[PDB]
Design a binder for this molecule. Structure first.
Ligand SMILES: COC(=O)c1cc2c3c(cc(O)c2[nH]1)N(C(=O)c1cc2cc(OC)c(OC)c(OC)c2[nH]1)C[C@H]3Cn1cnc(N)c2ncnc1-2
Ligand SMILES: [Ca+2]
Ligand SMILES: [Ca+2]
Length: 227
DNA sequence: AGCAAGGC
DNA sequence: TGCCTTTGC
């Protein structure tokens, strides 16, 4: 049972605003991996802000505590709220928090949580500490956990001109033989997105290195008509 | 605004 | 495959 007051207050308030009619289709959207209260993002963020306006944002010493308790609650809105809350502590998040973010990636894993954790929080950390990438990314690739593997792919998603091109292409080469839907998809996504910044090197990579057909199609879908 | 980004 | 709903922007 949760025990930090902020989290109790958020559980009560969210629970009071649940909508069973919305809950079933939302849960089916995540392949019924999670229970849902039935609260979509606009309302969900309104309710979180209510609790902050009342209690004020907890002291930074408790932010791991609070995220952990939210992660253990059964309804998916609490993990999504936990990530909205982590956004409000970005300034105090640093390399000592990488193992905590790993734990979050590998617990209650699905595309909605991992796609929020990785490009923003891990992306930011490794931009400040790129000498730590080698302690984590190779481990994640070798782990055979698809969510850590998608993390290795997507932590650079938002980098644009900051992208470490040879690192990106090494990561993809290590994972291109994956059968996994969420790995193939992530490879096609990061290539398509980086092609908005550096289209010529994405074209050259795709034309000379093996990829799942899904990944290759998605990567070139906006630039193929220039070639 | 409006368009770009899982489900089926 | 490409359109849907929702969220990100
Ligand atoms: C049933 O409803 C839920 O329960 C629920 C839906 C849902 C969604 C989430 C997250 C959730 O938690 C959701 N929950 N979305 C994102 O995380 C996200 C958007 C985004 C945009 C970007 O461009 C502007 C971008 O890059 C810059 C991103 O990367 C950071 C993006 N990420 C989008 C949407 C799910 N969806 C819908 N229709 C499509 N056609 C989609 N194609 C892909 N995904 C789609
Ligand atoms: Ca392997
Ligand atoms: Ca899609």
């Amino acid at each position: 049972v949760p025990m930090h007051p902020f989290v109790k207050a958020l559980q009560e308030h969210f629970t009071a605003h649940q909508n069973p009619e919305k809950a079933e289709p939302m849960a089916r959207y995540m392949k019924n991996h999670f229970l849902f209260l039935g609260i979509q993002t606009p309302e969900r963020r309104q309710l979180l802000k209510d609790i902050i306006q009342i209690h004020t944002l907890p002291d930074q010493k408790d932010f791991q505590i609070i995220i952990r308790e939210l992660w253990d609650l059964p309804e998916r809105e609490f993990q999504a709220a936990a990530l909205d809350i982590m956004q409000k502590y970005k300034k105090h998040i640093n390399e000592t928090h990488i193992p905590f973010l790993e734990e979050l990636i590998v617990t209650k894993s699905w595309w909605d949580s991992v796609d929020s954790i990785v490009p923003t929080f891990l992306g930011d950390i490794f931009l400040k500490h790129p000498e730590l990438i080698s302690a984590y990314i190779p481990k994640w690739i070798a782990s055979d956990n698809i969510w850590l593997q998608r993390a290795a792919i997507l932590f650079q998603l938002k980098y644009k001109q900051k992208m470490d091109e040879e690192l990106l292409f090494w990561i993809i080469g290590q994972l291109h033989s994956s059968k996994e839907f969420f790995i193939q998809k992530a490879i096609g996504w990061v290539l398509r997105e980086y092609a908005k910044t550096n289209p010529d090197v994405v074209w050259e990579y795709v034309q000379n290195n093996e990829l799942a057909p899904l990944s290759k199609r998605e990567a070139i879908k906006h630039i193929k008509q220039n070639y």
